[PDB]
């Protein structure tokens, strides 16, 4: 049946977060074997035990290049081949540019971009070897439009898209796809503040985690074998590309 | 269970060949009741899929026939939930040599019949608080392409039209979204990183995605399904 | 000097309107011979008389295909060949889609999209033979973003970008570029909702568009084709 | 004369390479006081000696965070306020993704992106205080289209646009614009060619004019954009 993912192996980073949890759940529901990454192991084994079978758990700190490298090799080995890498984990250090410290720029780049670079590198050669794979990168509406307060975040998320494009071209012949999803504003750790944003969402409501989760399922499906290099916007029409 | 359209009523224009037919098949496979538009007897496709099918011939060049088309499908299906604007033509050739007819014609089908048909179905979808409009544009609407000044206009305008309508009817839970097929000769293969032509099923799948309840929060967008030929 | 336009011949459509006159003045001041299109010929003469030397007057109703063809021909012959075409005139028939008329769609389509086609068709061949030319199309922010109550306008301004892209690819080799400019909002509940979305917090003036025309029309922009220049206060960032 | 820059103070990074030089020339021919950054000092003093006066020379190693900051401080002080910053210098560490080392990523991001962060952070506040500024970032078509062999570069160049959009939104009301130019541009040099409608390579002056346009008073209503100068290779 359509969009089936039975037997497919997925690794989802930031899998205890709002979106990562939701994505993990959806992959599982479609029959995937799901590896869940997180910073805290306790929160992870908790999502595990709740989903039942076909779950692996991989704690690691994404700041830490060497743990990211290990995260890759672990997943690939325990899972017996990762078919689906979802790069969802990502941090913020918001503030005005003219007050923005090196440490706030660095941390965001090294997490949102370079840990994506190293994890993806651990898993792409294997995927290519197998002639099958999906690399799905959670960017943000903000990487396309820009946003005040987030010079670092927007850079990291626009860059994520252009990394995605370059890789996609390079590995398309080997039946491995790479695509981005761009969430608008989604219910999470987050009234005037809120009203200003809602006035630009034509659909006049916030997003939910299922909205991103289902876009992941779509892109990871066989049926999406011919989509690579693209950015799928999920945002109630907040920005229309 | 995921991406289930059982009981939802969909109209696909240009359902007789190529993408329309593949789109219609996937809609059918997912439970939808599928109204089949085409220019010519179509009765064959109807007979292949059997149950949950309607047949609506019309000439899309005839604004009157497009109005009736929409009034008829709305009426006989008990309300269209999914409109797929698929049908479209080309009158290719260099800009210098391009007839007023070749311009007029392409715009009349690819743009204005879409204006008209959609206008027929939008209010009813609004009043039901539910609706999908999915428009098949083209890679060439975004990239431009020689020999196709008229086509590219129509396809580019199709996107533009969709965004604006997307903003108006969002609060009534009707989405509107484009799908940009790629190519669907080794000059063409050269520029496709995936080194294959697309097939109908690749576009039909994207239709189902966008048409699904799970895409309620997607609107105003263009989904490129193109082997990586142009990356936006 | 740079961005010098002396010796060049321009036709500007809707030259009497806000963007058109600004566009005309800036081309003129940069040395160009400008042909002013409009519908109300008496408004053309007023502009001419103010501007003096290096001016032609070409009244024409752009809703009239025949007149659009004749307009091209007359500008081509009388000006001694047109070097720069600025497709600027364009109408609105605003309103909610579900209320929109057959005539409300077709009239925007035929002015904003097909008269551009015919006019441009009239002058490209000449520019191709001379192996030098500039087609410059005034699109709009909303053609890229979309905007409610403007499904017809948005279709026409997105299509015009698509129009330009295809044409740009055809004639690039014969040194005629074709580009679009996308103005944002240009010169009290409606107003300041718009203003709330412009980070620069001011409206745009005709001179902001006029400068982008001069930039694209210049020899210095020979390697620019098929593009869209946004001049919008940072309202939309492409 | 339209697009006059007389008295405006500009700082150009990578001013010895092809693009940087043409940019420097065009700013200086349009009346601007131009400070020339470059890795190699010999070529700077050469180019500085060639153009009249209204030239300052500041060598710096952009891989060195502290030298980046010192470049900014020195250009702000020695020219008594920079008006126009052209972030042009960038590097490549090309190679297939699957063989790309930690350093080939790291070196590409530190220069093309994070040294741009620093430099720009050194000068924007001063610009905002003076109610006037131009930030002009040289990105690349590849940042938009993507390109095999250039995963690191594509990331940095894409990142560069995103950063520009964000900073542009923050400071627009202060009359400082921030914009990107995207240039396009063995003999499978002929494969690139066929894909260019204009059937021609980019030269420096094509990019140099786009900079003068964006640096002008006339481009004051333009902020947060990417100007493609690529002969139709990609049409956005």
PDB file of C-alpha atoms in Angstrom, chain C residues 48 90 127 185:
ATOM      1  CA  UNK C  48       7.209  66.387 -23.264  1.00  0.00           C
ATOM      2  CA  UNK C  90      -0.514  47.671 -16.200  1.00  0.00           C
ATOM      3  CA  UNK C 127      16.934  44.465 -31.512  1.00  0.00           C
ATOM      4  CA  UNK C 185       4.619  49.349  -2.359  1.00  0.00           C
TER       5      UNK C 185
END
